[PDB]
Design a protein around this ligand. Structure first.
Ligand code: ADP
Lengths: 281, 98, 49, 196, 49
């Protein structure tokens, strides 16, 4: 937004970017990821657990977010250096969970059960999978692909709104009240980006209002400042900021919005209400 | 209660061939009475799932481990469907005003 | 053969010298990374400060 | 009396901070943060530097331990003690943020702002900061008008949605057992009690 | 003689690869030194300011 609005600002590289791991997981095209490989091996011609693990190790072996489980595979098959920490996964019964096979006979029996509740529960049976030794009206989707479609629809919806993040931290893993673990809290603040999230608000301009919106919402502060008539929206805000005696390092005029530091609008809101206090009363 | 009763069927391994057997079908009868289905058909489907091999129908064989995995998958699907129905009913009750 | 073997000694000796210089030159940029990161860490903290 | 008792776990008495003499004494003492093996970051006084390092003494024990110059972090004056907004800290760093979070948690303040997103810490105990009186108090109050609280964030989001006419999303991120479920519960309760 | 010449070619290829790696490593030190001086130069006025 800063680059689009055209304002004095330098690109700050925070370093927080979990794109590599998200791609290794979900990226279907290019190098087959974990989910892509599991979906490709979802069929049952010759794939198994060991074969799937070998294929994954051969494909996504050089990825930086991929390592072996300790020295030997005693209780895990691979690791994924997530943003929080390293997790030891076990590729046991993964193909079955991805396919989710079900008995067709028992499914049909439950669908036609005498009970009304059981019949309503199994009313939808055209999406059940249960074959043995590619599309099928798009109903042959695995648990991994189904979750990706549900998550994609969710992430696409949250992006259209104004997310109000509420970060939650845990003191310790002992469920003890009043005992704060600094070693555990420090590891969370690093991956959560609490430090990087505060510097962008202080050094940046989290506040920003449109030229037209900034006029009607703050014209009562400096009524006798703009010529009583027609005036450009951009040039009109310049006269208001000059009359308010605001420092040059507290706002940035762009091409369509007027940015502000963290705490400028809070002061104008109080001054605006105090001006109309005699009118509201 | 039916989901809870599912799994208690202690399948036995036949001494002759590798085929599942239900010597004690009390849990099966209880599950059938709870879910509201037949016992003979449920047993025949769990021990001999009727599926076509490409042309005609044939009663495929199932082992002890295969039968246990099928029972577990059926219970998981039943619980998932129950949770989905509950969520749908909650949404309908919450979205009934305007 | 001595001429070819003689040239191999020069190439082998030069290769050994390059290896000794590589490990020595590698430490130049490797050790500089510590000072580079130290200056960057001090500069990053100074920029924030 | 319930509201008066719950106010203890919300507001902070600023009368015990206003002291220019204390700030001057702290500045003259020159204190900084240093790594620790059992407390994240502990205080320490800065002494004469020796090349790329500088010897420091721990305010707790008083042992002269050598610490690298890169691991040392500046300490905030006493004025920034249990601040209401983490974005107002002067010496923003990991040690200062951890110290502020610890002071707010041990004092009965799990909520702490941070620019545009609030931070919460699982208290593992039913606090009296949840009642109808508190919900009514936070009704129609700006973010900088009441102490940090999920009700404040909910009210701010509701006001933004009603003004800008743009949708909102009270997202909650954190490890398993951090308090996301309780935060969502309280947000829904506040929305049902206010937006009725 | 042909086999000995082959060893020289393989040895020369090794020393040649080491020379190419040294040039790349030397460029890193030269680039790091130039970047290191930038941080050192940017820290002078930074501390002064
Ligand atoms: N803000 C809070 N205040 C009091 N207790 C809490 C709070 N957040 C969590 N808890 C306690 O932590 C326990 C586990 O919480 P949990 O449901 O795991 O949270 P989440 O769903 O965010 O992981 C609960 O029994 C609850 O009493």
């Amino acid at each position: 937004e800063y680059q689009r609005e055209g304002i004095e600002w330098n690109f700050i590289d925070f370093g927080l970017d979990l794109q590599p791991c998200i791609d290794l997981i979900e990226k279907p095209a290019g190098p087959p990821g974990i989910l892509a490989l599991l979906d490709e091996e979802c069929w049952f011609p010759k794939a198994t657990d060991k074969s799937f693990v070998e294929k994954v190790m051969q494909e996504q072996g050089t990825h930086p977010k991929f390592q072996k489980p300790k020295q030997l595979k005693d209780k895990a098959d691979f690791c994924i250096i997530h943003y929080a920490g390293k997790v030891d996964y076990k590729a046991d019964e993964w193909l079955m969970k991805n396919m989710d096979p079900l008995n067709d006979n028992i499914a049909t029996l439950l669908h036609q059960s005498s009970d009304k509740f059981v019949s309503e529960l199994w009313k939808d049976v055209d999406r059940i999978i249960g074959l043995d030794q590619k599309t099928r009206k798009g109903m042959f989707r695995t648990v991994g692909q189904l979750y990706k479609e549900q998550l994609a629809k969710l992430m696409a919806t949250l992006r259209n709104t104004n997310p109000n993040f509420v970060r939650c931290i845990i003191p310790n893993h002992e469920k003890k009240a009043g005992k704060l673990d600094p070693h555990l809290v420090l590891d969370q603040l690093r991956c959560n980006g609490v430090l990087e999230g505060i510097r962008i608000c202080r050094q940046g301009f989290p506040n920003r209002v449109v030229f037209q919106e900034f006029r009607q919402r703050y014209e009562i502060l400096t009524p006798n400042s703009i010529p009583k008539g027609f005036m450009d929206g951009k040039q009109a805000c310049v006269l208001m900021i000059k009359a308010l005696e605001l420092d040059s390092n507290l706002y940035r005029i762009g091409q369509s919005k007027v940015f502000f530091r963290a705490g400028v609008l809070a002061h104008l809101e109080e001054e605006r209400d105090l001006k109309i206090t005699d009118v509201i009363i | 209660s039916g989901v809870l009763q599912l799994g208690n069927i202690v399948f036995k391994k036949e001494r002759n061939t590798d085929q599942a057997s239900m010597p004690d079908n009390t849990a099966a009868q209880k599950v059938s009475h709870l879910l509201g289905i037949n016992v003979t058909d449920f047993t025949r489907g769990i021990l001999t799932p009727r599926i076509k091999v490409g042309r005609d129908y044939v009663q495929k064989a199932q082992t002890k481990e295969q039968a246990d995995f099928a029972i577990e998958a059926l219970a998981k699907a039943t619980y998932e469907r129950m949770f989905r129905w509950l969520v749908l009913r909650i949404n309908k009750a919450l979205d009934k005003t305007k | 053969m001595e001429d070819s073997v003689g040239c191999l000694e020069t190439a082998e000796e030069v290769k050994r010298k390059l290896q000794k210089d590589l490990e020595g030159l590698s430490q130049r940029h490797e050790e500089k990374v510590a000072a580079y990161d130290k200056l960057e860490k001090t500069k990053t903290r100074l920029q924030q400060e | 009396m319930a509201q008066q008792a719950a106010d203890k776990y919300l507001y902070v008495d600023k009368n015990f901070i206003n002291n220019p003499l204390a700030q001057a004494d702290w500045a003259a003492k020159k204190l900084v943060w240093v790594p620790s093996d059992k407390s994240g970051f502990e205080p320490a006084s800065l002494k004469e530097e020796v090349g790329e390092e500088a010897i420091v003494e721990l305010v707790e024990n008083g042992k002269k331990v050598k610490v690298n110059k890169d691991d040392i972090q500046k300490m905030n004056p006493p004025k920034f003690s249990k601040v209401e907004d983490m974005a107002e800290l002067t010496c923003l760093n990991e040690a200062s943020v951890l110290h502020n979070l610890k002071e707010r948690y041990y004092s009965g303040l799990i909520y702490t702002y941070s620019g545009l997103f609030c931070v919460v810490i699982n208290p593992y105990k039913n606090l009296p900061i949840y009642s109808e009186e508190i919900v009514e108090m936070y009704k129609g109050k700006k973010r900088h008008e009441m102490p940090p609280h999920i009700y404040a964030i909910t009210d701010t989001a509701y006001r933004s949605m009603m003004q800008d006419r743009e949708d909102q999303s009270i997202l909650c991120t954190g490890e398993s057992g951090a308090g996301k479920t309780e935060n969502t519960k309280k947000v829904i309760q506040y929305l049902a009690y206010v937006a009725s």
